[PDB]
């Protein structure tokens, strides 16, 4: 079950209200392995509290680290089905234009399809 | 003397009728008047397909890559196009009866199905083990690119600089540093991307087309579901590509006709292209790299971004 499947809409809305109040300078982000992704491993924790100043490039490096990936391994972080146009984009901006109706900012990570 | 209905080369072209130019690795052709040139350019590219009856990999492994080597083959093709540009030039063209430059056979030899060839299926599959890929395991674009980079190290003849830009970002400073190493090592720039979850947003299509319109264009590797192809251009809303999905006997000497696809180029709807790809560019000189950067800047939505540090 994904994060959205483990907690109801109302529950998540409340999760966000609580976190945004306790941490006004933090962005609540849910990062999960794309449902069609099988090469990359699964995170131990998919709920993140990200400082609003952090940009995508920085976030990506952290997730790569968490996943214990080699820089040589393909990794992509997609928001609403697309990689952010610019990695220098602050998470605060991503949150403003891509956040879910429940208040969380959702992202999925994937590598690449294989062919034989 | 008999007069024959000499079926000219490009008479077999099966191109659609709506005349948008035809782009092949940085070259634009008219489907109306340059059918010969289009087919020559396509047939000239080094084509690598499945092969059977080559030396058993690892001595006791497969003697054919049918069914599992398709992406490795696409990797071979795009890297070979880089070597062709690096050693023969983008303007070089292959001719079935014309004696080719010795440098041509050196490039081809590097991809022959032999253990000692720099980029042979044997070398790629074995090097892939180090990348976490078992022999016979399917590859994605980046993986084969990473393997080719490691193999290129031993190719002191080409002495290439192979930069694989990860994370949708091309860092010029790192590229310059790599190329200025032991003053500029020809650059093979590979950019592995994931332009969507299951499809490619139409917004990237214009950008994708332009990736084939640059002088430095090496094309793209990726494909349709379960069908990897080496895309070398496009026409209208269709990508043009070389398909490795044909099993041919290992060459027994180098007779080279089987390494040239002398048929109307395969085409598939741009819409069918899966989001997992690797875009390639070749910059022989620092000026070529500067021009490429300028061309990228000129560019609905970008597939990657150019940054200094």
From Swiss-Prot, chain A:
Membrane topology recorded in Swiss-Prot or TrEMBL: Lipid-anchor
Transmembrane segments: none
Gene Ontology MF annotations: ceramide binding; microtubule binding; phosphatidylethanolamine binding; protein domain specific binding; tubulin binding; ubiquitin protein ligase binding
Lipidated sites in chain (Phosphatidylethanolamine amidated glycine): 116
Signal sequence, renumbered to the chain: none
PTM summary: The precursor molecule is cleaved by ATG4 (ATG4A, ATG4B, ATG4C or ATG4D) to expose the glycine at the C-terminus and form the cytosolic form, LC3-I. The processed form is then activated by APG7L/ATG7, transferred to ATG3 and conjugated to phosphatidylethanolamine (PE) phospholipid to form the membrane-bound form, LC3-II. During non-canonical autophagy, the processed form is conjugated to phosphatidylserine (PS) phospholipid. ATG4 proteins also mediate the delipidation of PE-conjugated forms.
Alphabetized UniProt keyword annotations: Autophagy, Cytoplasm, Cytoplasmic vesicle, Cytoskeleton, Lipoprotein, Membrane, Microtubule, Mitochondrion, Phosphoprotein, Ubl conjugation, Ubl conjugation pathway
Tissue-wise expression: Abundant only in neurons. Detected in testes.
Lipidation positions, renumbered (Phosphatidylserine amidated glycine): 116
Subcellular localization, as worded in the UniProt entry: Cytoplasmic vesicle, Autophagosome membrane; Endomembrane system; Mitochondrion membrane; Cytoplasm, Cytoskeleton
A biological process term (GO) from this entry: autophagosome assembly
Coiled-coil regions listed in the entry: none
Subunit text: 3 different light chains, LC1 (a cleavage product of MAP1B), LC2 (a cleavage product of MAP1A) and LC3 (produced by one of the MAP1LC3 genes), can associate with the MAP1A or MAP1B heavy chains. Interacts at microtubules with CABP1 (via EF-hands 1 and 2) but not with calmodulin. Interacts with FYCO1 (via C-terminus). Interacts with TP53INP1 and TP53INP2. Interacts with TBC1D25. Directly interacts with SQSTM1; this interaction leads to MAP1LC3B recruitment to inclusion bodies containing polyubiquitinated protein aggregates and to inclusion body degradation by autophagy. Interacts with ATG4B.
Protein family per UniProt: Belongs to the ATG8 family.
Annotated function: Ubiquitin-like modifier involved in formation of autophagosomal vacuoles (autophagosomes). Plays a role in mitophagy which contributes to regulate mitochondrial quantity and quality by eliminating the mitochondria to a basal level to fulfill cellular energy requirements and preventing excess ROS production.
Protein name: Microtubule-associated protein 1 light chain 3 beta
Organism: Rattus norvegicus (Rat)
Span covered, complete protein: 5 to 120 of 142
UniProtKB/Swiss-Prot annotation, chain B:
A Pfam family reported for this protein in Swiss-Prot or TrEMBL: ATG4_LIR
Regulation: Inhibited by N-ethylmaleimide. Redox-regulated during autophagy since reducing conditions activate ATG4A whereas an oxidizing environment such as the presence of H(2)O(2) inhibits its activity. The cysteine protease activity compounds is inhibited by styrylquinoline compounds 4-28 and LV-320.
Keywords: Acetylation, Autophagy, Cytoplasm, Cytoplasmic vesicle, Disulfide bond, Endoplasmic reticulum, Glycoprotein, Hydrolase, Isopeptide bond, Mitochondrion, Phosphoprotein, Protease, Protein transport, S-nitrosylation, Thiol protease, Transport, Ubl conjugation, Ubl conjugation pathway
Catalytic reaction equation(s): [protein]-C-terminal L-amino acid-glycyl-phosphatidylethanolamide + H2O = [protein]-C-terminal L-amino acid-glycine + a 1,2-diacyl-sn-glycero-3-phosphoethanolamine; [protein]-C-terminal L-amino acid-glycyl-phosphatidylserine + H2O = [protein]-C-terminal L-amino acid-glycine + a 1,2-diacyl-sn-glycero-3-phospho-L-serine
Active site, per annotation: 70, 243, 245
Claim: Protein biosynthesis is one of the keywords in the record: no
Location(s) in or outside the cell: Cytoplasm; Cytoplasm, Cytosol; Cytoplasmic vesicle, Autophagosome; Endoplasmic reticulum
Changes after translation: Phosphorylation at Ser-276 by ULK1 inhibits autophagy by decreasing both proteolytic activation and delipidation activities. Phosphorylation at Ser-276 is dephosphorylated by protein phosphatase 2A (PP2A). Phosphorylation at Ser-30 by AKT2 promotes its hydrolase activity, leading to increased proteolytic activation and delipidation of ATG8 family proteins.
Impact upon substituting residue 261 to S: Does not affect S-nitrosylation. Does not affect formation of disulfide bonds
Documented EC number(s): 3.4.22.-
A single MF term (Gene Ontology): cysteine-type endopeptidase activity
Result when mutating residue 117 to A: Decreased phosphorylation by AKT2
Outcome of substituting residue 30 to D: Phospho-mimetic mutant; increased proteolytic activation of ATG8 family proteins
Effect of residue 74 to S: Does not affect formation of disulfide bonds
GO annotation (BP), single: microautophagy
Subunit structure: Interacts with PFKP; promoting phosphorylation of ATG4B at Ser-30. Interacts with GBP7.
PANTHER family in alphabetical order: CYSTEINE PROTEASE ATG4, CYSTEINE PROTEASE ATG4B
UniProt function note: Cysteine protease that plays a key role in autophagy by mediating both proteolytic activation and delipidation of ATG8 family proteins. Required for canonical autophagy (macroautophagy), non-canonical autophagy as well as for mitophagy. The protease activity is required for proteolytic activation of ATG8 family proteins: cleaves the C-terminal amino acid of ATG8 proteins MAP1LC3A, MAP1LC3B, MAP1LC3C, GABARAPL1, GABARAPL2 and GABARAP, to reveal a C-terminal glycine.
Protein name: Cysteine protease ATG4B
Species of origin: Homo sapiens (Human)
Phylogenetic placement of the source organism: Eukaryota, Metazoa, Chordata, Craniata, Vertebrata
Gene assigned in the entry: ATG4B
């Amino acid at each position: 079950k994904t994060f959205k499947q483990r907690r109801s809409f109302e529950q998540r809305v409340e999760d966000v209200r609580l976190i945004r109040e306790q941490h006004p300078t933090k962005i609540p982000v849910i990062i999960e392995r794309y449902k069609g992704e099988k090469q990359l491993p699964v995170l131990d924790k998919t709920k993140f509290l990200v400082p609003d100043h952090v940009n995508m490039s920085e976030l990506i490096k952290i997730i790569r680290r968490r996943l214990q990936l080699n820089a040589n391994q393909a990794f992509f972080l997609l928001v609403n089905g697309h990689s952010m146009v610019s990695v220098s984009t602050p998470i605060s901006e991503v949150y403003e234009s891509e956040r879910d109706e429940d208040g969380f900012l959702y992202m999925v990570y994937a590598s690449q399809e294989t062919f034989g | 003397t008999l007069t024959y209905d000499t079926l000219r080369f490009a008479e077999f072209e099966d191109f659609p009728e709506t005349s948008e130019p035809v782009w092949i690795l940085g070259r634009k052709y008219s489907i109306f008047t340059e059918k010969d040139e289009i087919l020559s350019d396509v047939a000239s590219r080094l084509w690598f397909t499945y092969r059977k009856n080559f030396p058993a990999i690892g001595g006791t492994g497969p003697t054919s890559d049918t069914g599992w080597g398709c992406m490795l083959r696409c990797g071979q093709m795009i890297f070979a196009q880089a070597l062709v540009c690096r050693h023969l030039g983008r303007d070089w063209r292959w001719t079935q009866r014309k004696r080719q430059p010795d440098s041509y056979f050196s490039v081809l030899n590097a991809f022959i199905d032999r253990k000692d060839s720099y980029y042979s299926i044997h070398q790629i599959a074995q090097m892939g083990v180090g990348e976490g890929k078992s022999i016979g395991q399917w590859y994605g674009p980046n993986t084969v690119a990473q393997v080719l980079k490691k193999l290129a190290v031993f190719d002191t003849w080409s002495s290439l600089a192979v930069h694989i830009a990860m994370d949708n970002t091309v860092v010029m400073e790192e590229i310059r540093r790599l190329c200025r190493t032991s003053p500029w090592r020809p650059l093979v720039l590979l950019i592995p991307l994931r332009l969507g979850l299951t499809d490619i947003n139409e917004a990237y299509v214009e950008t994708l087309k332009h990736c084939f319109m640059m002088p430095q264009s090496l094309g793209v590797i990726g494909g349709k579901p379960n069908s990897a192809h080496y895309f070398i251009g496009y026409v209208g809303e269709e990508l043009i590509y070389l398909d490795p999905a044909t099993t041919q006997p290992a060459v027994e000497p180098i007779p080279d006709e089987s390494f040239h696809c002398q048929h109307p180029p395969c085409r598939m709807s741009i819409a069918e292209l899966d989001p997992s790809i690797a875009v390639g560019f070749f910059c022989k000189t620092e000026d070529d790299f500067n021009d490429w950067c300028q061309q990228v800047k000129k560019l609905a939505l970008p597939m990657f971004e150019l940054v200094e540090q």
